[PDB]
Amino acid sequence: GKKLLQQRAGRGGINFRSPSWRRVGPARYPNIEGDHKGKIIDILHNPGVTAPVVKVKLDNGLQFYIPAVQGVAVGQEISIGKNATISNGNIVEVGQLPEGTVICNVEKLKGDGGKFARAAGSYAVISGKAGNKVLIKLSSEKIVEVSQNARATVGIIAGGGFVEKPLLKAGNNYWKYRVRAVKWPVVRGVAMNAVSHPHGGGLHQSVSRPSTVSRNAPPGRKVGHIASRRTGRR
Amino acid sequence: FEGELKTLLRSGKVILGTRKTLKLLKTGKVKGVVVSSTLRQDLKDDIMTFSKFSDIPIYLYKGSGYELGTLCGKPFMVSVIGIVDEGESKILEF
Amino acid sequence: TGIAGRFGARYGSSTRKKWKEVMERRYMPHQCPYCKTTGKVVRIASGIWYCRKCETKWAGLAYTP
Amino acid sequence: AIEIGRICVKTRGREAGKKCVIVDIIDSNFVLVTGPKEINGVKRRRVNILHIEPTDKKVEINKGATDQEVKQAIEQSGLTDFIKEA
Amino acid sequence: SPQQRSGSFRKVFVKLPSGKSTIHYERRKDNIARCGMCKKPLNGVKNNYTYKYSKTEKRPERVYGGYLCHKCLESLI
RNA sequence: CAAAGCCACGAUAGGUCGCAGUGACCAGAGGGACCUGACUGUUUAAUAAAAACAUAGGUCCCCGCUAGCCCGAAAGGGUGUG
RNA sequence: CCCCAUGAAAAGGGAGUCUGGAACGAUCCCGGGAGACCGUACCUAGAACCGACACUGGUGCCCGGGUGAGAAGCCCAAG
């Protein structure tokens, strides 16, 4: 019948874009080629980020934004490049790091801007050294590999204890995603009419089919437990 | 260290408050000045800059105004200390 | 129970108790790492703190300096 | 230190960067100085002590002498154009 | 023309010897002009909804007098 | 401060009328036992407001960005100023 | 004081600093000259709009006394 709610987000309409003009800017590492020293000038909040950011002036006169790192302040100076030491907030490369180092916002390939450990509360740990690259573990206890000259920042991104405070109120939940393109509030499907949901319909609300399906399952039908390794509370 | 200081407060003349000592120090009429680590950096250089203009010994205090004031005994902190009379203590050589 | 009740008798005490304990730590008087605990610091937003003496903005946790 | 005959700058005021020579110490918080032949030739005017910043050059002058001798005293040291090099 | 914000809702009856009462609209206030690096509340510069062509009166005689105080400025000279 | 003129508010005494003194007007009936839904909220315009939906929370699944997710013919699009 | 919501951007103005230029020369006052084109009537709704109508439907928006907390009810000002 009429396509799924997940299907609707595939159109790329208004209901799914972000008002990033209300956001400070694209916070990825600006491209540098050597070693340079910068000072923090401001910290601002960025709505759909769940983590504070920093405005930092460059010694050569550049403006850029990076996720804010714990224990760093306005007016403190940050050096970036090969020569920089292991200090909180300094941006260095993995080639100089020792084992078990705590860093965040690790860059994948040179000049990309960092794609891992950029949210609040997380950190990056080093689990070894490869032949050409470095062993890095994210909070999900998995491992990724990034280049030698790939950049990173020593410290931890601010936002610890983020979810301890209960929402306590759907109003909070409503204004948590007021800017993020998450469709809110989420609506379950099992109570929906069958005309627009694979498990819709039926007076007695029940699971129509075993939710687990084969890997070759067509799009728009994969629902519920998708490629589950195991179920149960334990 | 503290025994040396505690003697000065007992009898030796002391100055409390940056404005007075900074007013006074530029005229080169202070025996010595001790500053805790908590001084606003805007003034620390000026003290250090003014330190060499009449060669007045300066001791850097790792503490804050509190422990400096707690030793000073005043309930409120002292950022700096001004001295115009060592009295009987043995601090100036430091 | 003080601040735990400022919403009346709603949402469940167990929820309230959890919201209770964390909240005081925000309002429990802290120690400014830069000037000193002399003045008190405030949490404008998660990670945002400065007392009214140091005038030193810095990165904090979600609810603690 | 703040001493007589030491060339020095002023933090503020119209000159706010021009120099004057210390002639006397009228009190613990004011001293009279004069940049005699600056580009503006600031007239003999005392100033607050928190209003100056000493330099690293000093000239020997008696107690509060006049313009003629500083006109010569500094050029005796040959620091005529170094008013700004001060 | 529809009830708007462009004009403070004033009237006229204090300083007034004739007999007639009405309404007037007048645009909002300014402040000391815009940008931000030292975020310091400035002073000593004139900013009226008209400009009297007063040259210096709107700017201090200090070196950076119209620019900002000496809190965040010794990075240039 | 305190006096004077004003002005508002809050109490005291005394007398006195009527059936009636928040005189009209304006203006909760209340109590007890039980079931269901946690609640404020939302919706069947023009037969239905509810126990129907969302909720705060617990719980599981997928995934290390050239990911995952989904849309088109294709350029690619959007979750991504992440 | 609140925020896991942090609450738009341009043009348009004004100022500051450094370079070059000519010596005349105004962000001063005084006298003089000019300043396209186009909107401009009326009605805002129990008769001026729509709902087929001179329609108790909707579409608006904003603003005296006493009694009285009151923009509640009543009555009476302006009309």
Swiss-Prot record, chain A:
GO cellular component entries: cytosolic large ribosomal subunit
Key words, A-Z: Ribonucleoprotein, Ribosomal protein, RNA-binding, rRNA-binding
Region (Disordered): 197-234
Gene3D superfamilies, per the entry: 2.30.30.30, Nucleic acid-binding proteins, Ribosomal protein L2, domain 3
Tree of life domain: Archaea
GO biological process, one term: cytoplasmic translation
Signal sequence interval, chain numbering: none
InterPro entries: NA-bd_OB-fold (IPR012340), Rib_uL2_dom2 (IPR014722), Ribosomal_uL2 (IPR002171), Ribosomal_uL2_arc_euk (IPR023672), Ribosomal_uL2_C (IPR022669), Ribosomal_uL2_dom3 (IPR014726), Ribosomal_uL2_RNA-bd_dom (IPR022666), Translation_prot_SH3-like_sf (IPR008991)
Bias kind Polar residues: ranges: 205-215
A single MF term (Gene Ontology): rRNA binding
Pfam family, one: Ribosomal_L2_C
Composition bias type Basic residues, residue spans: 222-234
Summary of subunit composition and partner proteins: Part of the 50S ribosomal subunit. Forms a bridge to the 30S subunit in the 70S ribosome.
NCBIfam families for this protein: PRK09612.1
Family: Belongs to the universal ribosomal protein uL2 family.
General function of this protein: One of the primary rRNA binding proteins. Required for association of the 30S and 50S subunits to form the 70S ribosome, for tRNA binding and peptide bond formation. It has been suggested to have peptidyltransferase activity; this is somewhat controversial. Makes several contacts with the 16S rRNA in the 70S ribosome.
HAMAP family xrefs: Ribosomal_uL2_A (MF_01320_A)
Name of the protein in question: Large ribosomal subunit protein uL2
Organism: Sulfolobus acidocaldarius (strain ATCC 33909 / DSM 639 / JCM 8929 / NBRC 15157 / NCIMB 11770)
Swiss-Prot record, chain B:
Xref: Pfam families: Ribosomal_L7Ae
GO CC field: cytosolic large ribosomal subunit
Protein origin, superkingdom: Archaea
Gene3D superfamilies hit by this protein: 3.30.1330.30
Annotated keywords: Ribonucleoprotein, Ribosomal protein
Family in the record: Belongs to the eukaryotic ribosomal protein eL30 family.
Source organism of the structure: Sulfolobus acidocaldarius (strain ATCC 33909 / DSM 639 / JCM 8929 / NBRC 15157 / NCIMB 11770)
GO molecular function: RNA binding; structural constituent of ribosome
Protein name: Large ribosomal subunit protein eL30
InterPro entries hit by this protein: Ribosomal_eL30, Ribosomal_eL30-like, Ribosomal_eL30-like_sf, Ribosomal_eL30_CS, Ribosomal_eL8/eL30/eS12/Gad45
Signal peptide: none
Biological processes annotated in GO: translation
UniProtKB/Swiss-Prot annotation, chain D:
Assigned keywords, A-Z: Ribonucleoprotein, Ribosomal protein
Name of protein: Large ribosomal subunit protein eL14
InterPro entries: KOW, Rib_uL2_dom2, Ribosomal_eL14, Ribosomal_eL14_arc, Translation_prot_SH3-like_sf
Organism: Sulfolobus acidocaldarius (strain ATCC 33909 / DSM 639 / JCM 8929 / NBRC 15157 / NCIMB 11770)
Cleaved signal peptide residues: none
UniProt GO MF annotations: RNA binding; structural constituent of ribosome
GO BP: ribosomal large subunit biogenesis; translation
UniProt gene name: rpl14e
Family: Belongs to the eukaryotic ribosomal protein eL14 family.
GO CC entries: cytosolic large ribosomal subunit
Entry-linked HAMAP family: Ribosomal_eL14
UniProtKB/Swiss-Prot annotation, chain E:
Gene Ontology CC: one annotated term: ribosome
Keyword Flavoprotein: no
Keyword Signal part of the UniProt annotation: no
Secretion signal, residue range per the UniProt entry: none
Keywords assigned by UniProt, alphabetized: Ribonucleoprotein, Ribosomal protein
Listed InterPro entries: Ribosomal_eL34, Ribosomal_eL34_C_sf, Ribosomal_eL34_CS, Ribosomal_L34e_arc-type
Entry-linked Pfam families: Ribosomal_L34e (PF01199)
Residue stretches spanning the membrane: none
Record-level Gene Ontology MF annotations: structural constituent of ribosome
Biological processes annotated in GO: translation
Family: Belongs to the eukaryotic ribosomal protein eL34 family.
The name this protein goes by in its record: Large ribosomal subunit protein eL34
